[PDB]
Amino acid sequence: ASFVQIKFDDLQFFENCGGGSFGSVYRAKWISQDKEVAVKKLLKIEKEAEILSVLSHRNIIQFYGVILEPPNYGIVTEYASLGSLYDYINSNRSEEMDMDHIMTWATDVAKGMHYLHMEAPVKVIHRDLKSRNVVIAADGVLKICDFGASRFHNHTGTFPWMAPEVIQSLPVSETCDTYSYGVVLWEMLTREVPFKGLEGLQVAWLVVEKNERLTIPSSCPRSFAELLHQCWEADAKKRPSFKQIISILESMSNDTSLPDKCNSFLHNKAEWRCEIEATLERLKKLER
Numbered sequence: 001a002s003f004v005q006i007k008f009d010d011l012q013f014f015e016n017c018g019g020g021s022f023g024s025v026y027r028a029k030w031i032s033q034d035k036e037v038a039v040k041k042l043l044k045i046e047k048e049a050e051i052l053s054v055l056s057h058r059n060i061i062q063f064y065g066v067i068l069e070p071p072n073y074g075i076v077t078e079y080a081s082l083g084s085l086y087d088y089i090n091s092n093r094s095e096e097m098d099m100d101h102i103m104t105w106a107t108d109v110a111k112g113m114h115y116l117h118m119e120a121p122v123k124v125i126h127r128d129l130k131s132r133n134v135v136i137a138a139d140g141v142l143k144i145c146d147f148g149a150s151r152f153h154n155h156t157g158t159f160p161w162m163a164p165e166v167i168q169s170l171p172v173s174e175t176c177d178t179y180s181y182g183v184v185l186w187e188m189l190t191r192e193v194p195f196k197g198l199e200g201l202q203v204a205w206l207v208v209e210k211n212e213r214l215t216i217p218s219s220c221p222r223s224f225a226e227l228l229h230q231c232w233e234a235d236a237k238k239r240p241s242f243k244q245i246i247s248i249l250e251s252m253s254n255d256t257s258l259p260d261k262c263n264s265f266l267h268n269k270a271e272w273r274c275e276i277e278a279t280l281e282r283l284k285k286l287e288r
């Protein structure tokens with residue numbers, strides 16, 4: 001092949017990651033290399049392996065090989081020991097997150113995406129980026145993944161992260177990923193699940209026809225809040241690219257006023273958490 005093949009019997013499978021909520025992904029050991037890995041079990045494999053071999057960057061999970069022994073198929077990668085971003089954020093351990101940490105992580109994600117959009121030898125538009133597709137390696141670095149679940153041609157309850165054009169099956173550019181990245185950032189700031197408890201269909205409807213967007217707290221510093229508005233524009237062409245996001249993050253890092261602003265916001269979760277809850281109460285009733 002043009003990609004590394006790993007034999008099914010050279011893997012020892014442990015748990016299904018996340019009790020099943022992240023699909024048919026397992027933690028395992030690659031026995032001949034004495035290495036811990038993740039495996040995603042598949043029922044078929046198209047020409048994914050060929051693209052995965054040529055994608056490699058410090059903010060994307062590392063491809064190691066493919067299981068190809070019909071009827072068994074799967075993709076084997078790096079296992080990120082600290083798990084999903086979604087899980088971390090929605091746990092109380094994320095209370096340690098300050099300004100710098102949110103800066104570093106928002107940067108990790110933007111650089112991975114910029115790579116996939118513009119620097120990799122082939123152009124990859126994720127189209128399903130969300131905090132349940134970002135994982136955390138033992139060193140603390142974020143790693144995007146699931147960028148080959150589409151098989152690189154549109155296939156063969158995650159409405160909160162989808163741009164409206166994606167929701168309504170319209171032409172998608174790079175900027176669909178900018179919108180989703182917005183949601184991710186908003187998660188890191190609020191440490192809430194976006195549209196928690198709403199229905200999929202209600203989210204879709206609201207986002208597309210009402211231009212409903214996640215509640216940004218009034219204490220949230222301006223810089224960040226504007227970034228969020230920019231990533232969330234219903235006119236996709238207006239949204240920034242990942243290189244511009246990276247450039248905006250950089251001038252944020254040099255604003256000496258922002259640390260204080262962000263950290264007191266982060267530390268006053270006591271206050272603003274029913275700004276968010278109020279809206280959700282209102283939206284749940286709009287359907288009841």
Ligand SMILES: CCCS(=O)(=O)Nc1ccc(F)c(C(=O)c2c[nH]c3ncc(-c4ccc(Cl)cc4)cc23)c1F
Pocket residue numbers: 017018019022025026038039040052061062063075076077078079080081083084087135145146147148149
């Ligand atoms: C190279 C990219 C190939 S792809 O086909 O686009 N994507 C692709 C292919 C194979 C995969 F295993 C995965 C994957 O899911 C993970 C990769 N590394 C991980 N480390 C930790 C966790 C984790 C651990 C614990 C919890 Cl509770 C949650 C997640 C999940 C994964 C994947 F996204």
